[PDB]
Amino acid sequence: HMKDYDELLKYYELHETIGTGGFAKVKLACHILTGEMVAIKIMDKNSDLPRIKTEIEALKNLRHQHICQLYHVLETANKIFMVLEYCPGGELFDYIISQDRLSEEETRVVFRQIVSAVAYVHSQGYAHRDLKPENLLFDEYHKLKLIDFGLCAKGALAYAAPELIQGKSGSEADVWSMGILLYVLMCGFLPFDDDTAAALVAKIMRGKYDVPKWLSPSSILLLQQMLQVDPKKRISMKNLLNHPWIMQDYNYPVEWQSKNPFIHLDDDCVTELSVHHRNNRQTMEDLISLWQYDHLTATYLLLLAKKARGKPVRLR
Amino acid sequence: MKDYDELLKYYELHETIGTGGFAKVKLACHILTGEMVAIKIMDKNTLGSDLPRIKTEIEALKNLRHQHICQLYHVLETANKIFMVLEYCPGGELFDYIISQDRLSEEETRVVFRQIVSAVAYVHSQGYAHRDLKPENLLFDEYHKLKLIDFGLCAKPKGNKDCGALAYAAPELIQGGSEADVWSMGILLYVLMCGFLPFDDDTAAALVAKIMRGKYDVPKWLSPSSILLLQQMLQVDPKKRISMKNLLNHPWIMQDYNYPVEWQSKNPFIHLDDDCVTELSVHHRNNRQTMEDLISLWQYDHLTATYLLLLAKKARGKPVRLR
Ligand SMILES: COc1cc(O)cc(Nc2ccc(C(=O)Nc3ccc4c(c3)C[NH2+]CC4)cc2)c1
Ligand SMILES: COc1cc(O)cc(Nc2ccc(C(=O)Nc3ccc4c(c3)C[NH2+]CC4)cc2)c1
């Protein structure tokens, strides 16, 4: 047997680890009924436990095309499992460091996905508080997914906002980190960087940085607005979404609004579930809208993704 | 880029495999030798109370050199980053092997268990106890050999003062030696041959009670040789548990091999392989005498990195050459 893995292994076929981290691990798996690939964050529950519990609560309320999806939560004797969206494309961090620097046009394709995700987070009354390129992953279609909501509220020093260091705690800090991200994408180096943490802090607080020769005046202007030391003088989310730089080859503002619904349900997905549970229709729809994040939330959301990639609405 | 400036002179960085907590493991390639490595990236200002678990592990690994222990090559430290350059183990956990199949035969378990015994007898000979033996902590290299990993809960039982999975934990360790490691090897032995733990429950309080009472199922498929080794290793009193010396040449261990476990290291601290020192002398452009004197330091810098990977490359049947 194994009593920690009995409930899990009714629903998932467990694959390669590709995980390690003292308390937390990540294992590849396959959802048995849909055939669909997932990633499982297996926890050794025993410590840092109600910061796993805040992440789960945030993710249960956040549903978005640029936020990596939670399907299922399972809890045993010495485990918490989190069944999550499959992101084989790697970190955004892995792209920056392996190559030199993206073009303005290349950075815009990527940055508009970061803005869409973060504007949705803030609309839900949350702040991520750990925005960095390690925390943005690519799916199998090369689209960005915001991960790790472990520091979220209703991080890395180089990305940290002056007021966050200098003793005030909320979503103005996220705009700053997006400005650090913007700079690294286009330059290939951080705007504030030092050999000692005490000299890094001093540079952030002062707020002076290099303006490379290759940067356009449009790029220089967005950077100055986002990298304001006073969080009151930093660009608002509303003005970011439709900024001239943001729309500079796209003749339209960032679509930050979710295409992943909580309150409207796919009929092909409800009929194909009514076949398995042998319910009527009203019974199946009423059960799904509970969003308990059990096997039913898992099967439905992995059915919704199955039709999206062309394949039929079919359970095995 | 300033955290990765020194690292990226020596290593080409590839796919991320761990992320868990403060620690991310990244695959990489050592530029000069061409040899594949794994890099443990510690966030220094995230760590906190679990930062002593890092410095003690490094110090233990600097002193442990064996064929059944995952080798440390290089330690690098920046503004907020500790790096640990480690041996490449693409075969997966021993955990992954166990859960995938039914339950390994007595003969299958012996091939594997003799590699665990070699590894742990060497640890104890160096005055350490691992304290976190479990199948998640044993990896396969590209040649299907087990390597012992994660020395974070490391001991020195009769040295100066500074736990693990509950199911593997020795009775005396719950209530508060290297006698505990022999118990955990006995839990490992049981799971390999049975496919289930000898003590298992839904609640931790009911697991502890089962460990302390020390009673367990003896499956019908288990040989009387297997039943005998198990009761010797799974003694509640750590004084009545089988010693390492008696384990090394136990009748169960020696079945089909007809020689005891060779636990002694084939990886030396003193003898400096000839071809490696001559290959390094031509690259650095100095004599064999002060190349040898510089290697002799074991600082765990780029020179330990290149030398120990050169020694690895030779053993693999490959040319002793840097680019
Ligand atoms: C909300 O999203 C979260 C929250 C959290 O706490 C952690 C994660 N972490 C993930 C990490 C990795 C993956 C993932 O799918 N990675 C993946 C999948 C396949 C392959 C690789 C990585 C790399 N080798 C090729 C195959 C998914 C979530 C998310
Ligand atoms: C003493 O050794 C240690 C100490 C420690 O604190 C952690 C580790 N962890 C490791 C984890 C993984 C690997 C490793 O090499 N795994 C690996 C390498 C390549 C591939 C895989 C895993 C699986 N995907 C295909 C390719 C090595 C050490 C060790």
XYZ file of C-alpha atoms and ligand atoms in Angstrom:
697
model
C 0.000 0.000 0.000
C 1.228 3.431 1.386
C -1.603 5.313 3.244
C -0.473 8.839 2.132
C -0.879 8.006 -1.596
C -4.076 5.815 -1.559
C -6.681 8.601 -2.238
C -4.422 10.427 -4.687
C -3.645 7.276 -6.744
C -7.368 6.492 -7.381
C -7.428 9.655 -9.583
C -3.801 10.217 -10.741
C -1.032 8.117 -12.312
C 2.185 9.484 -10.695
C 5.214 10.211 -13.056
C 8.765 11.778 -12.783
C 9.555 13.908 -9.716
C 11.384 17.021 -11.112
C 10.990 18.450 -7.552
C 13.080 19.023 -4.317
C 12.931 21.676 -1.552
C 13.064 20.478 2.069
C 9.296 20.623 2.828
C 7.841 20.952 -0.717
C 8.226 18.776 -3.854
C 6.632 18.759 -7.347
C 5.754 15.504 -9.154
C 4.454 15.061 -12.705
C 1.238 13.017 -13.004
C -1.575 12.094 -15.367
C -5.305 12.505 -14.570
C -6.751 8.979 -15.183
C -10.299 9.871 -16.506
C -9.410 12.768 -18.898
C -5.916 11.519 -19.833
C -4.695 15.046 -19.109
C -1.248 15.942 -17.742
C -0.968 17.867 -14.430
C 1.764 18.877 -11.893
C 1.330 17.806 -8.189
C 2.797 19.882 -5.330
C 3.234 17.176 -2.668
C 3.891 18.692 0.746
C 5.462 17.099 3.825
C 2.888 18.665 6.216
C 4.716 17.423 9.441
C 5.864 24.501 10.322
C 5.113 26.884 7.344
C 1.607 25.487 7.086
C -1.024 28.328 7.123
C 1.005 30.037 4.281
C 0.187 26.946 2.163
C -3.426 27.559 3.516
C -3.482 31.267 2.356
C -2.137 30.304 -1.132
C -4.928 27.642 -1.532
C -7.648 30.155 -0.441
C -6.331 32.790 -2.911
C -6.150 30.250 -5.804
C -9.746 28.999 -5.067
C -10.876 32.600 -5.801
C -8.459 33.431 -8.706
C -9.400 32.030 -12.232
C -7.512 33.471 -15.277
C -5.793 32.457 -18.605
C -2.411 33.892 -17.327
C -2.619 32.437 -13.728
C -1.675 28.742 -13.464
C -4.898 26.856 -12.394
C -5.565 24.823 -9.198
C -7.699 21.681 -9.956
C -7.746 19.572 -6.780
C -6.700 19.753 -3.085
C -6.116 16.434 -1.182
C -4.963 16.094 2.495
C -3.711 12.893 4.220
C -1.806 11.880 7.463
C 1.471 13.700 6.548
C 0.627 15.260 3.121
C -1.072 18.209 1.392
C -1.408 17.722 -2.377
C -2.119 20.545 -4.858
C -3.024 19.432 -8.386
C -1.956 22.271 -10.750
C -1.777 23.285 -14.452
C 0.941 21.636 -16.619
C 3.669 24.237 -17.552
C 6.501 22.391 -19.462
C 7.924 25.568 -21.063
C 10.188 26.617 -18.208
C 10.624 29.816 -16.157
C 10.703 33.244 -17.807
C 13.984 33.583 -15.785
C 15.479 30.680 -17.904
C 14.864 32.683 -21.083
C 16.456 35.968 -19.888
C 19.723 34.383 -18.612
C 20.310 31.853 -21.501
C 20.015 34.586 -24.182
C 21.235 38.215 -23.951
C 18.324 40.705 -24.346
C 14.824 40.830 -25.931
C 13.749 43.517 -28.452
C 11.068 46.095 -27.390
C 8.552 44.179 -29.614
C 9.538 40.776 -28.047
C 9.242 42.244 -24.479
C 5.766 43.739 -25.257
C 4.320 40.281 -26.331
C 5.510 38.926 -22.913
C 4.823 42.022 -20.706
C 1.164 42.328 -21.855
C 0.617 38.810 -20.418
C 2.211 39.846 -17.057
C -0.074 43.021 -16.972
C -3.250 40.960 -17.808
C -2.541 38.479 -14.975
C -1.559 41.139 -12.281
C -4.511 43.492 -13.146
C -6.863 40.529 -12.572
C -5.183 39.717 -9.150
C -5.688 43.364 -7.989
C -9.332 43.397 -9.235
C -9.941 40.452 -6.809
C -8.512 42.474 -3.861
C -5.154 40.567 -3.709
C -1.483 41.543 -4.193
C 1.012 38.817 -5.321
C 4.008 40.372 -3.352
C 6.617 38.079 -5.087
C 6.662 39.118 -8.771
C 9.957 38.011 -10.448
C 10.801 36.008 -13.656
C 11.226 32.755 -11.652
C 7.469 33.078 -10.813
C 6.247 33.236 -14.474
C 6.090 29.910 -16.371
C 5.369 28.967 -20.002
C 2.656 26.470 -20.861
C 2.923 23.959 -23.785
C 1.601 26.772 -26.117
C 4.326 29.283 -24.944
C 1.863 31.423 -22.875
C 2.858 32.888 -19.447
C 1.354 31.559 -16.133
C 1.765 33.374 -12.773
C 2.677 30.857 -10.051
C 3.517 30.663 -6.261
C 0.981 32.753 -4.275
C 2.805 31.862 -0.996
C 3.566 35.542 -0.127
C 0.148 36.911 -1.368
C -2.065 39.285 0.724
C -5.805 40.275 0.630
C 10.107 38.487 -1.785
C 13.440 38.877 -3.710
C 15.323 42.004 -2.628
C 16.193 43.268 -6.174
C 12.405 43.306 -7.002
C 11.267 44.754 -3.662
C 9.601 48.198 -3.568
C 11.268 50.925 -1.391
C 8.237 51.262 0.967
C 8.118 47.449 1.441
C 11.732 47.384 2.699
C 11.532 50.730 4.593
C 8.580 49.694 6.808
C 5.056 50.034 5.360
C 3.459 46.527 4.880
C -0.401 47.110 -0.843
C -0.749 46.668 -4.634
C 1.490 49.701 -5.490
C 4.487 47.409 -4.673
C 3.450 44.966 -7.486
C 3.615 47.809 -10.053
C 7.248 48.508 -8.946
C 8.309 44.743 -9.416
C 6.635 44.823 -12.909
C 8.903 47.839 -13.662
C 12.016 45.860 -12.512
C 10.787 42.943 -14.752
C 10.291 45.377 -17.683
C 13.921 46.669 -17.272
C 15.591 43.142 -17.092
C 13.621 41.960 -20.211
C 14.877 44.853 -22.395
C 18.409 45.308 -20.852
C 19.590 41.864 -19.682
C 20.592 43.265 -16.237
C 18.785 44.554 -13.075
C 18.369 48.385 -12.586
C 19.637 48.000 -8.934
C 22.303 45.298 -8.215
C 25.195 44.943 -5.713
C 27.662 42.478 -4.036
C 26.196 43.275 -0.558
C 22.468 43.385 0.488
C 23.085 46.627 2.535
C 24.392 48.358 -0.682
C 21.449 46.937 -2.722
C 18.882 48.456 -0.225
C 20.641 51.890 -0.432
C 20.403 51.831 -4.301
C 16.639 50.911 -4.226
C 15.866 53.737 -1.669
C 17.842 56.386 -3.721
C 16.118 55.041 -6.912
C 18.771 56.080 -9.522
C 19.473 53.644 -12.416
C 21.254 53.344 -15.796
C 19.321 54.260 -18.944
C 20.906 52.136 -21.793
C 21.574 53.763 -25.214
C 19.392 51.156 -27.084
C 16.190 51.981 -25.054
C 13.545 54.007 -27.002
C 12.087 57.245 -25.420
C 8.759 55.312 -25.074
C 10.581 52.606 -23.007
C 12.417 55.291 -20.929
C 9.037 56.992 -20.131
C 7.125 53.815 -19.008
C 10.142 52.863 -16.808
C 10.284 56.236 -15.046
C 6.479 56.048 -14.246
C 6.633 52.464 -12.813
C 10.000 52.975 -10.970
C 8.891 55.909 -8.739
C 10.257 55.653 -5.168
C 7.036 57.344 -3.742
C 4.223 54.692 -4.205
C 1.691 57.573 -4.506
C 3.534 58.901 -7.663
C 3.780 55.398 -9.306
C 1.545 54.732 -12.355
C -1.917 53.276 -11.490
C -3.130 49.936 -12.931
C -5.880 51.770 -14.981
C -3.229 53.957 -16.706
C -0.913 50.980 -17.268
C -3.567 48.886 -19.112
C -3.888 51.513 -21.920
C -0.396 53.193 -21.750
C 0.963 54.310 -25.233
C 3.941 51.823 -24.849
C 1.465 49.026 -23.972
C -0.494 49.643 -27.247
C 2.516 50.415 -29.516
C 2.062 47.596 -32.186
C -1.283 46.306 -30.776
C -4.051 48.719 -31.659
C -5.942 47.910 -28.383
C -5.469 47.920 -24.540
C -4.563 44.793 -22.437
C -7.507 42.381 -21.981
C -7.074 41.677 -18.216
C -10.638 40.189 -17.847
C -10.891 36.413 -17.260
C -11.990 34.002 -20.027
C -12.180 31.227 -17.348
C -15.705 31.454 -15.710
C -16.859 30.659 -12.120
C -20.588 31.294 -12.724
C -21.152 30.128 -16.449
C -20.678 26.358 -17.236
C -19.760 24.410 -20.494
C -22.761 22.286 -21.579
C -20.686 19.624 -23.482
C -18.651 19.282 -20.172
C -21.867 18.992 -18.033
C -23.451 16.372 -20.458
C -20.151 14.286 -20.553
C -20.127 14.376 -16.671
C -23.885 13.473 -16.421
C -22.937 10.264 -18.356
C -20.263 9.243 -15.661
C -22.137 10.133 -12.423
C -25.448 8.967 -14.031
C -27.163 12.237 -12.837
C -29.837 14.200 -14.767
C -28.496 17.732 -15.551
C -29.804 20.107 -12.825
C -28.143 17.654 -10.310
C -24.752 17.831 -12.157
C -24.763 21.656 -12.663
C -25.724 22.241 -8.971
C -22.898 19.933 -7.766
C -20.211 21.619 -9.962
C -21.035 25.233 -8.778
C -20.048 24.177 -5.185
C -16.330 24.545 -6.345
C -15.108 22.299 -3.487
C -11.785 21.620 -5.363
C -12.328 17.848 -5.210
C -12.290 15.211 -8.021
C -15.362 16.878 -9.679
C -13.664 20.392 -9.876
C -10.584 18.513 -11.294
C -12.472 16.432 -13.979
C -14.641 19.435 -15.108
C -11.718 21.954 -15.487
C -9.525 19.278 -17.242
C -12.558 18.485 -19.554
C -12.842 22.246 -20.351
C -9.106 22.239 -21.314
C -9.507 18.985 -23.397
C -12.014 20.595 -25.873
C -9.885 23.766 -25.931
C -6.969 21.725 -27.539
C -9.363 20.237 -30.168
C -9.591 16.658 -28.739
C -13.094 15.238 -27.888
C -15.065 15.761 -24.643
C -14.423 12.132 -23.479
C -13.817 10.399 -20.136
C -12.005 6.980 -20.117
C 23.037 38.679 -13.284
C 25.506 39.489 -10.353
C 24.393 36.345 -8.416
C 25.054 34.228 -11.537
C 28.199 36.067 -12.901
C 30.790 33.779 -11.146
C 28.753 30.555 -11.673
C 28.257 31.284 -15.460
C 32.061 31.553 -16.118
C 32.239 27.795 -15.265
C 28.746 26.363 -15.953
C 26.162 26.475 -18.758
C 22.801 26.544 -16.852
C 19.866 24.226 -18.189
C 16.348 23.043 -17.007
C 15.099 23.610 -13.388
C 14.255 20.344 -11.522
C 13.652 21.495 -7.880
C 11.866 24.687 -6.534
C 10.163 23.607 -3.236
C 11.216 26.331 -0.756
C 14.382 28.499 -0.388
C 16.111 25.901 -2.637
C 15.881 25.419 -6.408
C 17.849 22.607 -8.136
C 18.976 23.425 -11.698
C 20.608 21.150 -14.291
C 23.866 22.511 -15.789
C 26.939 21.565 -17.857
C 30.554 22.098 -16.722
C 32.113 24.098 -19.627
C 35.760 22.735 -19.585
C 35.077 18.953 -19.077
C 31.672 18.865 -20.852
C 30.392 16.837 -17.853
C 26.751 17.219 -16.693
C 26.129 18.340 -13.056
C 23.146 19.360 -10.783
C 23.233 22.811 -8.992
C 21.476 23.493 -5.660
C 20.623 27.267 -5.527
C 19.929 28.462 -1.836
C 18.233 31.877 -1.358
C 20.293 33.283 1.563
C 17.734 35.878 2.806
C 14.713 33.400 2.589
C 16.502 30.554 4.572
C 16.508 31.912 8.168
C 16.150 29.225 10.917
C 16.808 26.447 8.304
C 20.196 28.004 7.194
C 22.205 25.872 9.794
C 20.860 22.798 7.828
C 22.984 24.121 4.831
C 26.431 24.884 6.450
C 26.517 21.552 8.426
C 25.550 19.536 5.286
C 28.399 21.235 3.242
C 30.948 20.475 6.066
C 29.818 16.794 6.224
C 30.003 16.440 2.367
C 33.535 18.022 2.334
C 34.605 15.054 4.544
C 32.467 12.267 2.951
C 33.893 10.861 -0.289
C 32.398 7.518 -1.494
C 30.975 5.632 -4.573
C 27.495 5.467 -2.972
C 27.269 9.121 -1.865
C 26.323 11.943 -4.301
C 29.589 13.918 -4.747
C 29.961 17.669 -3.959
C 32.271 19.407 -6.562
C 32.018 23.160 -5.979
C 30.626 25.655 -3.410
C 30.036 29.298 -4.561
C 28.572 32.137 -2.410
C 27.260 35.530 -3.667
C 25.247 38.549 -2.230
C 22.244 36.266 -1.478
C 23.087 32.912 -3.128
C 24.767 29.690 -1.889
C 25.428 27.306 -4.809
C 26.259 23.589 -4.428
C 27.531 21.820 -7.586
C 26.625 18.097 -7.236
C 26.824 14.695 -9.078
C 24.368 14.074 -11.977
C 21.655 11.452 -10.998
C 19.102 11.150 -13.907
C 17.707 7.757 -12.784
C 15.204 9.137 -10.255
C 14.430 8.387 -6.581
C 14.376 4.864 -5.143
C 10.837 6.029 -4.031
C 9.777 6.307 -7.772
C 11.054 2.761 -8.499
C 9.131 1.203 -5.455
C 5.677 2.907 -6.211
C 5.878 2.041 -9.978
C 6.219 -1.769 -9.481
C 4.469 -4.305 -7.232
C 7.164 -5.318 -4.715
C 10.788 -6.278 -5.571
C 11.936 -9.933 -5.180
C 14.382 -10.886 -2.333
C 17.163 -11.071 -5.009
C 16.187 -7.615 -6.467
C 16.125 -6.049 -2.954
C 19.604 -7.517 -2.105
C 21.247 -5.869 -5.232
C 19.821 -2.491 -4.022
C 20.193 -2.993 -0.210
C 23.933 -3.907 -0.430
C 24.422 -0.430 -2.032
C 22.541 1.244 0.916
C 24.700 -0.766 3.459
C 28.026 0.184 1.711
C 26.944 3.908 1.720
C 25.739 4.013 5.442
C 28.693 1.918 6.864
C 31.028 4.520 5.310
C 29.030 7.459 6.908
C 29.303 5.809 10.410
C 33.043 5.089 9.929
C 33.490 8.901 9.505
C 31.701 9.576 12.847
C 28.426 10.834 11.250
C 24.817 9.586 11.249
C 22.561 10.525 8.258
C 19.321 10.724 10.435
C 17.006 10.955 7.336
C 17.296 7.565 5.569
C 14.197 6.969 3.355
C 13.754 5.985 -0.354
C 13.250 9.667 -1.419
C 16.886 10.228 -0.267
C 18.464 7.522 -2.525
C 18.958 8.389 -6.244
C 20.044 6.369 -9.315
C 22.905 7.568 -11.486
C 23.057 7.059 -15.301
C 24.591 3.542 -14.605
C 21.660 2.461 -12.223
C 23.812 2.817 -9.077
C 22.331 4.265 -5.833
C 23.837 7.524 -4.400
C 22.953 8.822 -0.843
C 21.654 12.482 -0.936
C 20.505 15.344 1.434
C 22.766 15.419 4.533
C 20.666 18.294 6.022
C 19.694 16.374 9.201
C 23.392 15.113 9.665
C 24.703 14.272 13.106
C 28.219 13.487 14.467
C 26.728 11.223 17.266
C 29.726 11.375 19.637
C 30.957 14.870 18.651
C 29.810 18.406 19.504
C 26.039 19.231 19.662
C 24.218 21.475 17.034
C 14.845 13.980 12.863
C 13.174 12.981 9.507
C 10.079 11.039 8.299
C 8.037 9.600 11.188
C 7.413 6.135 9.567
C 11.261 5.637 9.372
C 12.035 7.093 12.807
C 13.561 4.849 15.522
C 11.622 4.484 18.850
C 14.401 6.158 20.921
C 14.531 9.093 18.456
C 10.787 9.881 19.039
C 11.160 9.895 22.875
C 14.476 11.853 22.754
C 23.350 7.352 18.093
C 23.971 5.744 14.642
C 21.769 2.875 16.022
C 18.757 4.847 14.654
C 20.140 4.569 11.054
C 20.200 0.731 11.362
C 16.433 0.832 12.311
C 15.605 3.090 9.238
C 17.561 0.633 6.968
C 15.288 -2.076 8.421
C 12.120 -0.057 7.535
C 13.654 0.389 3.988
C 14.340 -3.384 3.828
C 10.653 -4.156 4.757
C 9.072 -1.690 2.179
C 11.351 -3.030 -0.651
C 10.241 -6.683 -0.119
C 6.572 -6.065 0.931
C 5.409 -2.885 -0.879
C 4.013 -1.420 2.385
C 5.449 0.105 5.613
C 5.673 -2.166 8.766
C 4.068 0.697 10.860
C 1.466 2.997 9.157
C -1.556 5.045 10.364
C -3.885 7.986 9.440
C -2.841 9.948 12.583
C 0.731 10.692 13.805
C -0.263 9.881 17.471
C -1.368 6.348 16.348
C 1.799 5.915 14.196
C 4.084 6.746 17.236
C 2.199 4.170 19.421
C 2.765 1.440 16.714
C 6.555 2.243 16.438
C 6.993 2.153 20.295
C 5.077 -1.243 20.589
C 7.186 -2.490 17.645
C 4.803 -5.245 16.406
C 4.452 -5.738 12.597
C 3.020 -8.080 9.912
C 5.251 -10.880 8.598
C 3.973 -11.571 4.982
C 3.656 -15.234 3.797
C 6.022 -14.635 0.786
C 8.969 -13.572 3.079
C 11.725 -16.246 3.434
C 12.945 -17.283 6.968
C 16.293 -15.543 6.108
C 14.359 -12.264 5.409
C 12.245 -12.750 8.628
C 15.495 -13.170 10.679
C 17.369 -10.064 9.310
C 14.180 -7.986 9.861
C 13.745 -8.907 13.544
C 17.476 -8.139 14.212
C 17.287 -4.642 12.569
C 13.725 -3.843 13.899
C 14.508 -4.177 17.643
C 12.827 -1.459 19.774
C 15.844 -1.469 22.249
C 18.793 0.149 20.278
C 21.190 -2.001 22.388
C 19.605 -5.255 20.998
C 19.675 -3.999 17.319
C 22.248 -5.627 14.970
C 25.650 -3.825 14.745
C 27.062 -2.498 11.456
C 29.971 -5.078 11.541
C 27.437 -7.978 11.783
C 25.243 -6.475 9.058
C 28.206 -6.290 6.546
C 28.621 -10.120 6.552
C 25.087 -11.257 7.587
C 24.033 -14.610 5.909
C 21.146 -12.710 4.119
C 23.565 -10.050 2.681
C 26.049 -12.672 1.406
C 23.468 -14.984 -0.259
C 24.232 -15.336 -4.051
C 27.337 -12.994 -3.770
C 29.403 -15.165 -1.332
C 31.503 -12.076 -0.243
C 30.627 -9.353 2.376
C 29.682 -5.690 1.566
C 32.688 -3.587 0.418
C 31.896 -0.316 2.328
C 35.421 1.178 1.973
C 35.865 4.176 -0.341
C 37.252 3.809 -3.882
C 37.284 7.669 -4.111
C 40.584 8.949 -2.468
C 41.374 12.226 -0.650
C 45.230 11.573 -0.890
C 46.222 9.797 -4.206
C 45.948 12.310 -7.051
C 45.261 10.496 -10.374
C 48.162 10.931 -12.817
C 46.357 11.704 -16.134
C 44.124 14.374 -14.419
C 47.122 16.229 -12.849
C 48.989 16.107 -16.258
C 45.835 17.209 -18.141
C 45.360 20.152 -15.639
C 49.114 21.095 -15.801
C 48.903 21.577 -19.611
C 45.738 23.759 -19.323
C 46.935 25.942 -16.365
C 50.544 25.918 -17.809
C 52.450 24.984 -14.590
C 54.498 21.900 -13.358
C 53.034 18.597 -11.943
C 54.377 19.595 -8.507
C 52.358 22.792 -7.716
C 49.309 21.645 -9.719
C 49.329 18.689 -7.278
C 49.905 21.110 -4.284
C 46.936 23.312 -5.372
C 44.640 20.191 -5.856
C 45.775 19.040 -2.321
C 43.865 22.045 -0.718
C 40.237 20.668 -1.196
C 38.812 24.228 -1.065
C 35.818 23.010 -3.180
C 36.435 25.737 -5.823
C 36.744 25.479 -9.679
C 39.946 23.401 -9.314
C 38.156 20.689 -7.172
C 35.319 20.963 -9.771
C 37.548 20.298 -12.805
C 39.741 17.635 -11.060
C 36.859 15.501 -9.647
C 34.906 15.693 -12.912
C 38.157 14.756 -14.837
C 38.481 11.723 -12.446
C 34.777 10.928 -13.223
C 35.262 11.292 -17.045
C 38.307 8.844 -17.001
C 36.339 6.194 -14.994
C 33.465 6.515 -17.647
C 35.773 5.275 -20.491
C 36.095 8.764 -22.027
C 38.992 11.082 -23.116
C 40.852 12.963 -20.330
C 40.504 16.403 -22.130
C 39.391 20.046 -21.316
C 38.343 22.580 -24.056
C -0.544 28.762 -8.876
O 0.519 28.037 -9.490
C 1.487 27.502 -8.680
C 1.618 27.637 -7.307
C 2.669 27.020 -6.646
O 2.823 27.138 -5.294
C 3.589 26.267 -7.362
C 3.468 26.120 -8.740
N 4.458 25.362 -9.411
C 4.540 24.651 -10.631
C 5.813 24.265 -11.026
C 6.001 23.543 -12.187
C 4.920 23.197 -12.988
C 5.107 22.402 -14.247
O 4.134 21.955 -14.850
N 6.384 22.207 -14.675
C 6.863 21.302 -15.657
C 6.061 20.398 -16.344
C 6.612 19.551 -17.283
C 7.976 19.587 -17.559
C 8.792 20.486 -16.871
C 8.225 21.337 -15.928
C 10.276 20.566 -17.137
N 10.777 19.407 -17.928
C 9.894 19.112 -19.085
C 8.537 18.648 -18.597
C 3.641 23.575 -12.591
C 3.453 24.296 -11.424
C 2.407 26.743 -9.390
C 24.711 15.064 -1.374
O 23.819 15.196 -2.478
C 22.766 16.061 -2.352
C 22.492 16.934 -1.316
C 21.350 17.718 -1.354
O 21.085 18.605 -0.354
C 20.470 17.612 -2.421
C 20.733 16.732 -3.469
N 19.812 16.661 -4.542
C 19.907 16.248 -5.896
C 18.723 16.178 -6.626
C 18.731 15.772 -7.949
C 19.926 15.431 -8.575
C 19.966 15.004 -10.012
O 21.033 14.954 -10.622
N 18.777 14.677 -10.587
C 18.453 14.570 -11.965
C 19.352 14.845 -12.993
C 18.965 14.722 -14.314
C 17.671 14.334 -14.643
C 16.762 14.057 -13.621
C 17.160 14.181 -12.290
C 15.352 13.647 -13.960
N 14.984 14.276 -15.257
C 15.869 13.810 -16.356
C 17.311 14.238 -16.105
C 21.113 15.512 -7.850
C 21.105 15.914 -6.525
C 21.885 15.952 -3.413
